[PDB]
Design a binder for these strands. Structure first.
Lengths: 68, 96, 55, 100, 131
RNA sequence: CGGAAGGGCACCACCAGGAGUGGAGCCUGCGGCUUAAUUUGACUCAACACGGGAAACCUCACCCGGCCCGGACACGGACAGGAUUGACAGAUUGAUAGCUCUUUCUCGAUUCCGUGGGUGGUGGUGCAUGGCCGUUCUUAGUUGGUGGAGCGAUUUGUCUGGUUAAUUCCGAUAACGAACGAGACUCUGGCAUGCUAACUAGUUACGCGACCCCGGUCGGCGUAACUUCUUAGAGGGACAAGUGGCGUUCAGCCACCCGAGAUUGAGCAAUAACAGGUCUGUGAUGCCCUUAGAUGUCCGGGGCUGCACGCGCGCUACACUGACUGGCUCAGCGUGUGCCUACCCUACGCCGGCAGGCGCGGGUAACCCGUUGAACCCCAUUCGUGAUGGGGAUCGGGGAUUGCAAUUAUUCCCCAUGAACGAGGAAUUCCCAGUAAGUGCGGGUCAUAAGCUUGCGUUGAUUAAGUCCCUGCCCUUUGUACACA
């Protein structure tokens, strides 16, 4: 059956191979280098990193965004 | 249905604890009346139990505005091997 | 928010608020004595509730 | 001692046999009885259309449901009248024993 | 009871209670020769009696379906445990029970017996029972 | 079946009349004509205030857009080296929908993608169905069994006639005895100074208290008798039973005493049928359609009301048998705090002219609103035949309440505006006693809410106790080359 508009195709997401290993810097010792600050947020503490956007920071699930 | 497994296992736990279960057809009911200890939307109890039914694990009987779900032998065996329990214990319907 | 919009509209009154306790439709409802049964469903089950044609 | 037994029933002759039975039980247990005071009958009346559609002559159904209320007041310690009222129950009537 | 509702609303509440109970039990015990219900709310007992023709099928294997039905009764209508007691019993001279005979014909038609043979088979049993 | 004859019955027929409808204004349901849409079912009685349909959103189908999966299930690439869900700015929109262009964080095999198969559906066919309903018809009609008559299909009973609300009966009679429908039956109204009972009903007497001059008044206060008044149980009572007429002397009809009634009103309802209505009452339901850009469903906007038009049901009037202003005085049916469900009935004390606001209370109700101080009517004024103080359409301005929201005014209040209408053409409707009509009060719908409908009491008649003239339907006789008639 004929419609008015040529439709909007649904948002297909950009799936990526390992966005994880870009969360840490590797050392040649047996030590570490944590890239993005760890928010001590109510529920989402240690393993939950903050977002590093071009204008502000953002904590994922508690939604705790920060002006630079 | 897209489901939280936490809520899904809590439904399966109560279903076992008492073999048969009742659910009103009201998909826009915020919390389930019985399991108010858990945050269970009525939609999710219905969708879980109708998914159980499709394979022939539960017995579906419908009145005016209430689903009635009795447990079968197929459901008994799936539910017990799934929750990873002692094989001896059974629903509240069997014990004399 | 999808879940801020799905059941966003308020229902405290009108005939979209109240529902037939049998067939679930929204015309010719009996609300007298807290029945909440549509007139056709009432008339079907009327003798089982206790209502009797005398006069 | 001043205790209030009320009987609320949809059927009449059922209610009358229960009213008789409590007078019998009271006069046998040798305690003062106030006879069965008959409160006015309430007639729950609902009048609907007959036709499911609206393509007929306008004929209405007149559904009635009478509900009858008796009460007997006795001068008796709780126990003996409690054991009088624990026997000879039928499905029609409903009991309320009120102390104060 | 502190909710303390009118005797008018109380009796229409009891009216719809029996009406749905009967609907549910006619839908459930349809094939297994179901005749009807009865309630006897005694002091702190809801003695809820069922009348059937094939009571062995409905009370089932060592009382599976009875406790299943007592569970959904207490669960849906919101009753106290211990207080609700179901009792399936056989109705006398089934030949005269219009419910039992109508559902018997229905399941002979569901089997696939001839229509004049189904009706005359039923009608002959009704008459020799003493209608 | 007849364009042949005859006989019956009915205020959905007439006669005698009453109220009217048709005329005017508005409310409201149809067609029409506009519109993105103004969704639609029904069209003589048996469509058109009907779908309980009084829709501001929802309701809600219609239409202009925007989210959404609630696609179970078996199978197949995909896969944690992550399938996927959620997402704050910013442009995006109507939206604080992460729907999106563009950000980077979150989530953990329940996703998402094809193959089937399922689903939901106020989508389609009521000319595929069930159920319920309406109509023929609430008219009086329908059928065995033994017996009789015919070779037989069939017929008699079920009839010329009188009578009845009635195929109701008694009469004649090859029929006798019966069954369904009529009746009987259930509820209801009127009667009991007889009976059983009453602090959730009274009364009478009494003691007290207040006021007028021993009495009088009190719904002012309080406790021994009793059941007249109120309540609701059991029996009683009325049967054309008494008398006088008429009649085949029957069935029964008319009048009159006595008597609370000399026909109170409803509920139910046959055999057989209709292509009557409903798939938009149902998670009654065959088949078809659709099934992700949905005919599923949620969301926000409008529409269901649009106005040269023609119909139908109602409301208010056209005035003095009246309008206005005071004063006096009397009802009966009900209903009332909710499952999800939020919203109940209201007395009383202050505030405001009014609609209202605030305060403490009673009530799950013969207990509180309540002795339900209702209207018409009644008594006393002002008006004075003038489209007038008749009538209140249309329009302007302000103020309250309900709601998340009132413009296309929800409703209500206050001032102002003052339309036709001077009793209604053809045609046509309902109705015989506590009836018609006037009059207001409750129930339904209901957050708000009656010009509708369903009940209730108050005031309360004129005319008739007849008929087949009119419109219908029903029977008997007769005729037929008809029998899907």
């Amino acid at each position: 059956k004929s419609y008015t508009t040529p439709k909007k195709n649904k948002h297909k997401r950009k799936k990526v191979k390992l966005a994880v290993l870009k969360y840490y810097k590797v050392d040649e010792n047996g030590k570490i280098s944590r890239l993005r600050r760890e928010c001590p947020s109510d529920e989402c503490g240690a393993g939950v990193f903050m977002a590093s956007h071009f204008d502000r920071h953002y904590c994922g699930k508690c939604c705790l965004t920060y002006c630079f | 249905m897209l489901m939280p497994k936490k809520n899904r296992i809590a439904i399966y736990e109560l279903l076992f604890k008492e073999g048969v279960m009742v659910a009103k057809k009201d998909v826009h009911m915020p919390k389930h009346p019985e399991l108010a200890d858990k945050n269970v939307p009525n939609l999710h109890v219905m969708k879980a139990m109708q998914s159980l039914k499709s394979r022939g694990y539960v017995k579906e009987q419908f009145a005016w505005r209430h689903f009635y779900w009795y447990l079968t032998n197929e459901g008994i065996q799936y539910l017990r091997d799934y929750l990873h329990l002692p094989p001896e214990i059974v629903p509240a319907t069997l014990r004399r | 928010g999808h879940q801020q919009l799905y059941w966003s509209h308020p229902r405290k009154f009108g005939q979209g608020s109240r529902s037939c306790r049998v067939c679930s439709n929204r015309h010719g409802l009996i609300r007298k004595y807290g029945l909440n049964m549509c007139r056709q469903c009432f008339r079907q089950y009327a003798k089982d509730i206790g209502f009797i044609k005398l006069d | 001692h001043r205790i209030r037994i009320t009987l609320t029933s949809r059927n009449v002759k059922s209610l009358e046999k229960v009213c008789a039975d409590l007078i019998r039980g009271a006069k046998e247990k040798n305690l003062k009885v106030k006879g069965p005071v008959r409160m006015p009958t309430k007639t729950l009346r609902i009048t609907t259309r007959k036709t499911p559609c609206g393509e007929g002559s306008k004929t209405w159904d007149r559904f009635q449901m009478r509900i009858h209320k008796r009460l007997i007041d006795l001068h008796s310690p709780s126990e003996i009248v409690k054991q009088i009222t624990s026997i000879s129950i039928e499905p029609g009537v409903e009991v309320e024993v009120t102390i104060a | 009871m502190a909710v303390q509702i009118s005797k008018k609303r109380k009796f229409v509440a009891d009216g719809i209670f029996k009406a749905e109970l009967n609907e549910f039990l006619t839908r459930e015990l349809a094939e297994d020769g179901y005749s009807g219900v009865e309630v006897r709310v005694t002091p702190t007992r809801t003695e809820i009696i069922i009348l059937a023709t094939r009571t062995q099928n409905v009370l089932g294997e060592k009382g599976r379906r009875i406790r299943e039905l007592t569970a959904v009764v207490q669960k849906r209508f919101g009753f106290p445990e211990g207080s609700v007691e179901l009792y399936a019993e056989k109705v006398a001279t089934r030949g005269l029970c219009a419910i039992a005979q109508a559902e018997s014909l229905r399941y002979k038609l569901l089997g696939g017996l001839a229509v004049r043979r189904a009706c005359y088979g039923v009608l002959r049993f009704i008459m020799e029972s003493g209608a």
